[PDB]
Design a protein around this ligand. Structure first.
Ligand SMILES: CCCCCCCCCCCCCCCCCC(=O)OC[C@H](COP(=O)([O-])OCC(O)COP(=O)([O-])OC[C@@H](COC(=O)CCCCCCCCCCCCCCCCC)OC(=O)CCCCCCCCCCCCCCCCC)OC(=O)CCCCCCCCCCCCCCCCC
Ligand SMILES: CCCCCCCCCCCCCCCCCC(=O)OC[C@H](COP(=O)([O-])OCC(O)COP(=O)([O-])OC[C@@H](COC(=O)CCCCCCCCCCCCCCCCC)OC(=O)CCCCCCCCCCCCCCCCC)OC(=O)CCCCCCCCCCCCCCCCC
Ligand SMILES: CCCCCCCC/C=C\CCCCCCCC(=O)OC[C@H](COP(=O)(O)OCCN)OC(=O)CCCCCCC/C=C\CCCCCCCC
Ligand SMILES: CCCCCCCC/C=C\CCCCCCCC(=O)OC[C@H](COP(=O)(O)OCCN)OC(=O)CCCCCCC/C=C\CCCCCCCC
Ligand code: HEC
Ligand code: HEC
Ligand code: HEM
Ligand code: HEM
Ligand code: HEM
Ligand code: HEM
Ligand SMILES: CC1=NC2=C(CCCC2)C(=O)C1c1ccc(Oc2ccc(OC(F)(F)F)cc2)cc1
Ligand SMILES: CC1=NC2=C(CCCC2)C(=O)C1c1ccc(Oc2ccc(OC(F)(F)F)cc2)cc1
Ligand code: FES
Lengths: 239, 147, 378, 378, 239
């Protein structure tokens, strides 16, 4: 139980006033869709969430229509299955956690909605995990199905390397290298966990500027009123 | 009057009838055969009851008391020698141990690397306490109430 | 005559706010009272607005908090203001107490003791607040800390289950923690008013620890304008956290929902309890550890009785000054140690820091006062 | 000298509670202030204990209230104390106001107007309280009453949907109604303290409406012992309802869960709003009806300006006495009419009663005062 | 739309201090069980609720074991069906309201948990409804399935007369007449809606007695303190 913490990668949103690369989000979504969404749930992100972020209203409607979802009851009293719409959330792979464990040999795949925020290191951590899969060192092996990752705590994970070169063709035609696929999906998972990111930082700039204005002004008002007292001289004049 | 009023309001905060309903679980001892483990749902947790063989009793009796991480003899972990009742939560970081496996032939965890013996005591692994011994009593010889 | 001194409502405002005689020379450390007030009001508003969207049912709880941050309009900025606002509160509290200790304001016994009560109330509030999101650290923090009370002989075990309203921290615990957490700030506001009511019996202490009746200035405009400047700086600190690092003072594990099986790696309370959490872990015996954790706070009530120096403030007291700054540095050490796993060398450092905490308050700083006196022929 | 007059906290208690100079001759109608206080404290405690078990989520809400009554220990007695306690509050309120009107206590303008505010706050609290169980009458009552505000030109329709936090009374409305309903009693307690703060500027009026400075008695023991007796009688009334007829002052339809389709037969608010509900239904136009319902309460603020008599109390005023008792009987008629379906003869009776309400306050009772004066050569 | 309100029957629990007839509750439960529970839900009453009221712990365990209920998931991730226990509530006939409507031609059978409290007249109302079914008067008929009851609002109901002579054999051997069956089931539905009934009234008696004691005592204390003032005489003595 030694520990290797991730390095700090220069993300396009690393800086105080730096926004998320939304085209990177658009790619990263597809990396969740094509790769993860058969194993991990992402319960807090709905198809409407994508609109004005990585996709248009019309694009997000198409992505929603593509998937199954249960709905009901109808007047007969039965539960049917229907094409999705914007109001529907991203669908869970399994009906419950106990079903999920069975499909992945005991291990439960965590929901990805907040995984950037729920793990120390965030996108730096996840990126290292996804790209960091390597052959085990000598003196080592885990149970048949538990793989070696140097960034996972206890050095052994229960996830098959999920990303590799050309695991997906991207919609905008970006060369899908392992590191490009990881970079994009991390950028999406960052936005998943923290949609507010871009607004938050817009507000930050406007706060810094207003404080830049108001602090020395209020400080000047302070010194102005207090100047009666700062200037004053005393004299003791006994008889 | 004030005794009554206060005492009722105090009562309010204590467990409601539906929480007391889930307090205890009755297990039929003739429904678990000698050697096999049977899991149960208790207070939103697994609960392992295990019928132990004449071999498992004697093999867990003469174990080294000092060598263990958490020194407990077997005859003080249970009320009847042929029955060991335990919470099925791994004490380190919370998993569900799988029955009839591991090095020490009892319960084993594929999370970090813990090995429990047949008495539920940690032998070789990262866990700090043994598997938890709940509060229980045998009523008639056929039945057990845990809680 | 004016209608500021005449009108029954304005009279209280005029005397406790505008024409209040304040010492000429009070420093930045006197701003923290006003800032504590702002914190409290800030928590109440943000809190109330959050309560319009939150639910205390165990299944929906985590979801409601996230629903606030994603679907509710500006719910995120409200939520993170409230969480960082709680940190800002405790920053303000310890600074405010430190001032009291250093400048000997604690001689105002009633004001001081009401303070102790206020501290304990804000603690109780913030402990129960952190449970409400119903994440891992929420649930597991609440479980470990509450269950310390089982260490009391005879009654302890019942007591714990009675707080819980069950056999673990579950449905009835979360719902009541929401109800208590809602009501308590209002109780704080009341006690805070009594706090000032006693302060305005004596008026303020100042940095010299020498009486300032000979040189009082009216509160308005001098301190109304300073307090505005202070407020402005508090808002900056808060919003720097909220808009640039809202997760900095929390924990990640509180972003995964509460799991009664799956235990987090290093379970710990929020940063402002860490010092006392370290003291608890110093003592090997559990009831001993609880009584030490309790005495680590309650000892504040004992400070005035331990005062030995013939001078009130530490301004003119070099030895006490050093010992004070040692006590601060020690508390910073206990906070660090509180955040660590229970292993070498953090056990021994923790023990040594906890020894030094009580040693500084009960022995060294009293001795230092009397040494200082005998150096001045006193 | 004693430590009742000396100690900063005891000083306020000694002056406003013990050594308070009270008129010798104040009747049973002066007990209602104390009883309103008891009601408020009773609601807060019972309420807080209920909030430890309730949830504001629309799906679980009705279930939680019933879970209180069936599974929570003595949750039933708490729940029905709180519901009948709300009735007891309003009984106490209207009796308290009636006293003020009859004996002309409203001349104490600030005390009186703070009263009006208190009344309006208790109303707002109790309206939102009745929604919390999320039964039929809860949901449908809230829907109709809130949606009256849509009658305001330009803004009204937005305003309604903004209160709701949606397009109907749904998830966000119930959650916020829980939050507002929790906070408001505490705001009441504050305003109630300001209420008394102004009362203790003048001291109490009495039944004669003649100044009582010549014959004051200390509050203790005379009125401490009377107030205890009053409290005892309030508890009797409350517990007679709670233990013998807990459903008497409510409605059955609030025992079936809220259904946004299925409308109840005769939708109506709780009994203490019925008088003003009848006034609303008198006017054929909707905005007119809303402005009349609003003016049926706010007219209380106008009463002091309408005072014509050279004598303060109605004790020595036969004509006013009759007109007062007519106004009471009319209000009892409006309550009856409010509870009825909109049909003959309840429409016409309702119209005629609503006419007589405003006629009595704005024309007849002022005229009667001036007639009484001219009968006394005044 | 004329209206016939029910008469006030002399129930064994009618009076201020009169408890519920618990043997009547025991019978009345069976009238819910044998007759209603295939149409009406009663969601707020569980099998544990019966213990110490109409049945023993052991009897209530037997009644619970008799019925089906869904439970899960098991470790495989499936939802199974199991024998009931005390912690289980009385099971709903249908999976949802929409299914219930279909089985009863549009009309939804109301949940009976609170039906005594949710209808004006209470047990007097329900008793009149159950026994009051009669042949329609001349000039009258409703849709094929909507029956005539003079106590139901609008004079036409959507429920087939559910009680008649010997619709059940009672466990204690009471002659099961239509009026006996209705009386018993009402007494049970009263307890359903208001379990507190007996405790409530026990408290009522103890309140009435303590108030009987304390009111004249506190009143005596009042007159005692005030007696200084009630007695006093004044005299005006100008010079
Ligand atoms: C001659 C005949 C002599 C025998 C007569 C005995 C008379 C006792 C006097 C009496 O009636 O007062 C009870 C009175 C009110 O209790 P109650 O009548 O049961 O209240 C009604 C409800 O049951 C509400 O009560 P509650 O449920 O809130 O309170 C109890 C509950 C509270 O905690 C939990 O919920 C768990 O604890 C329990 O679960 C029961 C075990 C008791 C734990 C005490 C630990 C002892 C060490 O409490 C007291 O005034 C204190 C005396 C307590 C009884 C003595 C035992 C404890 C010693 C404490 C010192
Ligand atoms: C909703 C809750 C409302 C609470 C109201 C608060 C009432 C209050 O505290 O004021 C004391 C208020 C004034 O009565 P008091 O102090 O005798 O003053 C009588 C006058 O001096 C006038 O004296 P009087 O010479 O005209 O004689 C009147 C005599 C009644 O004359 C008769 O003998 C009949 O006394 C009463 O008014 C008491 C009636 C109670 C009779 C029960 C038998 C004991 O007492 C009541 O209104 C009745 C409460 C007594 C409960 C007794 C239960 C046994
Ligand atoms: C933690 C960080 C502390 C930051 C301190 C900034 C450093 C500057 C400084 O404070 O030191 C100087 C020093 C000189 O003061 P005087 O002797 O009054 O002035 C002489 C003439 N000028 O100023 C002070 O001592 C500041 C007053 C003490 C404030 C206490 C600091 C508060 C934070 C510690 C928490 C203590 C909590 C105890 C909880 C139990
Ligand atoms: C509604 C029920 C009202 C119950 C009244 C009981 C009847 C007895 C009675 O009050 O009448 C007598 C009458 C004689 O009083 P004095 O002239 O002061 O005394 C002369 C010497 N003894 O006493 C009173 O007038 C009582 C004081 C008036 C209290 C007001 C009644 C309160 C209830 C009505 C609500 C009004 C609310 C207005 C809301 C808008
Ligand atoms: C066929 C299975 C499978 C696929 C494909 C898969 N995962 Fe997972 N994942 C798992 C399992 C099982 C775990 C739990 C591992 C454990 O606890 O040892 C897991 C764990 C994780 C964790 C948690 C690591 C931690 O710190 O605990 C992250 C982050 C994660 N996956 C992200 C991804 C991303 C990003 C992709 C694809 C772009 C992906 N996964 C594809 C099965 C999968
Ligand atoms: C096979 C169907 C069926 C059986 C058997 C049945 N019910 Fe019903 N019940 C209904 C339907 C359908 C309604 C709704 C009627 C309507 O709205 O017109 C109803 C309505 C009611 C109502 C509501 C009346 C009102 O005021 O609205 C009560 C009370 C009631 N049933 C009690 C009983 C009792 C008691 C029994 C047996 C001891 C019973 N029911 C047996 C189908 C049934
Ligand atoms: C919610 C918490 C609190 C609030 C709102 C509060 C409020 C205030 C305010 C407004 C002042 C006057 C301004 C100032 O000197 O800072 C003050 C002074 C004081 N407070 Fe607090 N306080 C709180 C907690 C505490 C605590 C925890 C203590 C001590 C343990 C304390 C002890 C004092 C003392 C001694 C003074 C007098 C300072 C002097 O005159 O030099 N207070 N408080
Ligand atoms: C001294 C005053 C208060 C303090 C110190 C305080 C502290 C806290 C803290 C630390 C949290 C957890 C924040 C998080 O991690 O998300 C919290 C949550 C919450 N508080 Fe408060 N609080 C205060 C007053 C109030 C008041 C007055 C209300 C409501 C009227 C309120 C309502 C809430 C709600 C609904 C939550 C859950 C939402 C959330 O997690 O942000 N709080 N509080
Ligand atoms: C929560 C609501 C209220 C509380 C707790 C409250 C409390 C009190 C108390 C304790 C008194 C002194 C005792 C007494 O004479 O009854 C009082 C007096 C008074 N209150 Fe209220 N009150 C409330 C509402 C109102 C309302 C709604 C009005 C008028 C619209 C009002 C007007 C007055 C007046 C005029 C007096 C002076 C009576 C006199 O001296 O004769 N109050 N109130
Ligand atoms: C002037 C003070 C108050 C009034 C007039 C009032 C009034 C009401 C009313 C009429 C109801 C509906 C009762 C019912 O039909 O069941 C209610 C429910 C409720 N009130 Fe209050 N309330 C007050 C203060 C409080 C306070 C301070 C709290 C919590 C701190 C509270 C918590 C509740 C809760 C949780 C419910 C739902 C449970 C129930 O239905 O009984 N109330 N309130
Ligand atoms: C009331 C106050 N008295 C004094 C000093 C220093 C100098 C002398 C004494 C203060 O700064 C001071 C004060 C306190 C609080 C201020 O803002 C508030 C903040 C909150 C508030 O609400 C409440 F009641 F405290 F909860 C009320 C006021 C503004 C000024
Ligand atoms: C403060 C009071 N003043 C007066 C009279 C009549 C006579 C003269 C003036 C009173 O009866 C009186 C009073 C008021 C309330 C009493 O009990 C309380 C009830 C509630 C309470 O809390 C609070 F603040 F009102 F919310 C505080 C006290 C007891 C006495
Ligand atoms: S998690 Fe199973 S032993 Fe560490």
């Amino acid at each position: 139980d030694l520990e290797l913490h991730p390095p700090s990668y220069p993300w396009s949103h690393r800086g105080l006033l730096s926004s998320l690369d939304h085209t990177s989000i658009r790619r990263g979504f597809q990396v969740y869709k094509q790769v993860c969404s058969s194993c991990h749930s992402m319960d807090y992100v709905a198809y409407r969430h994508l609109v004005g972020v990585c996709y248009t209203e019309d694009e997000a409607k198409a992505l929603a229509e593509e998937v199954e979802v249960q709905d009901g009851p109808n007047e007969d009293g039965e539960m049917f299955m229907r094409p999705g719409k914007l109001s529907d959330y991203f669908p869970k792979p399994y009906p419950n956690p106990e079903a999920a464990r069975a499909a992945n040999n005991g291990a439960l795949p965590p929901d990805l909605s907040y995984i950037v925020r729920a793990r120390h290191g965030g996108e730096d951590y996840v990126f290292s995990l996804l790209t960091g899969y390597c052959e085990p060192p000598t003196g080592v092996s885990l149970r048949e199905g538990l793989y070696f990752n140097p960034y996972f705590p206890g050095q052994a994970i229960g996830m098959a390397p999920p990303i590799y070169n050309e695991v997906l063709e991207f919609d905008d035609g970006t060369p899908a290298t392992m590191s490009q696929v990881a970079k994009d999906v991390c950028t999406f998972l960052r936005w998943a966990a923290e949609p507010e990111h871009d607004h938050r930082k817009r507000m930050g700039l406007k706060m810094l500027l207003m404080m830049g204005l108001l602090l020395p002004l209020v400080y000047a008002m302070k010194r102005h009123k207090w100047s009666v007292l700062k200037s004053r001289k005393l004299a003791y004049r006994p008889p | 009057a004030a005794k009554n009023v206060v005492s009722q309001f105090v009562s309010s905060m204590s467990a409601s009838a539906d929480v007391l309903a889930m307090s205890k679980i009755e297990i039929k001892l003739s429904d678990i055969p000698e050697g096999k483990n049977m899991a149960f749902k208790w207070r939103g947790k697994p609960l392992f009851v295990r019928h132990r063989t004449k071999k498992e009793i004697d093999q867990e009796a003469a174990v080294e008391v000092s060598q263990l991480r958490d020194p407990q003899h077997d005859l003080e972990r249970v009320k009847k020698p042929e029955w060991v009742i335990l919470i099925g939560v791994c004490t380190h970081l919370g998993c569900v141990p799988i029955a009839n496996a591991g090095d020490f032939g009892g319960y084993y965890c594929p999370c970090h690397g813990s090995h429990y013996d047949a008495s539920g005591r940690i032998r070789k692994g990262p866990a700090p306490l043994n598997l938890e011994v709940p509060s229980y009593e045998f009523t008639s010889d056929d039945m057990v109430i845990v809680g | 005559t004016n209608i500021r001194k005449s009108h029954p409502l304005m009279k209280i405002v005029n005397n406790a706010f505008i024409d209040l005689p304040a010492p000429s020379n009070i420093s930045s450390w006197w701003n923290f009272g006003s800032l504590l007030g702002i914190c409290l009001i800030l928590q109440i508003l943000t809190g109330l607005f959050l309560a319009m969207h939150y639910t205390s049912d165990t299944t929906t709880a985590f979801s409601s908090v996230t629903h606030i941050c994603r679907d509710v309009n500006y719910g995120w900025i409200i939520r993170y203001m409230h969480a960082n606002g709680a940190s800002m509160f405790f920053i303000c509290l310890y600074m405010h107490v430190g001032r009291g200790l250093y400048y000997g304001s604690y001689t105002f016994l009633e004001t001081w003791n009401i303070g102790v009560i206020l501290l304990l109330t804000v603690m109780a509030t913030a402990f129960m607040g952190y449970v409400l999101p119903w994440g891992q650290m929420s649930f597991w923090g609440a479980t470990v800390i509450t269950n310390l009370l089982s260490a009391i002989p005879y009654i302890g075990t019942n007591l714990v289950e009675w707080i819980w309203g069950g056999f673990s921290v579950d449905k009835a615990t979360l719902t009541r923690f929401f109800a208590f957490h809602f009501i308590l700030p209002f109780i704080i506001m009341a006690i805070a008013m009594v706090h000032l009511l006693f302060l305005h019996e004596t008026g303020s202490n100042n940095p010299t620890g020498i009486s300032s009746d000979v040189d009082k200035i009216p509160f308005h405009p001098y301190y109304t304008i300073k307090d505005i400047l202070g407020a402005l700086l508090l808002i900056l600190a808060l919003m720097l956290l909220v808009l640039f690092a809202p997760d900095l003072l929390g924990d990640p594990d509180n972003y995964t929902p509460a799991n009664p099986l799956n235990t987090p790696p290093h379970i710990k309370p929020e940063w402002y309890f860490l010092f006392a959490y370290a003291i608890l872990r110093s003592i090997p015996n559990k009831l001993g550890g609880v009584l030490a954790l309790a005495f680590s706070i309650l000892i504040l009530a004992l400070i005035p009785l331990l005062h030995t120096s013939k001078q009130r403030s530490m301004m003119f007291r070099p030895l006490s000054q050093c010992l004070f700054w040692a006590l601060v540095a020690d508390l910073l050490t206990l906070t660090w140690i509180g955040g660590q796993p229970v292993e070498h060398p953090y056990i021994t450092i923790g023990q040594l820091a906890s020894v030094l905490y009580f040693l500084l308050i009960l022995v060294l700083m009293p001795t230092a006062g009397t040494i200082e006196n005998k150096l001045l022929k006193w």
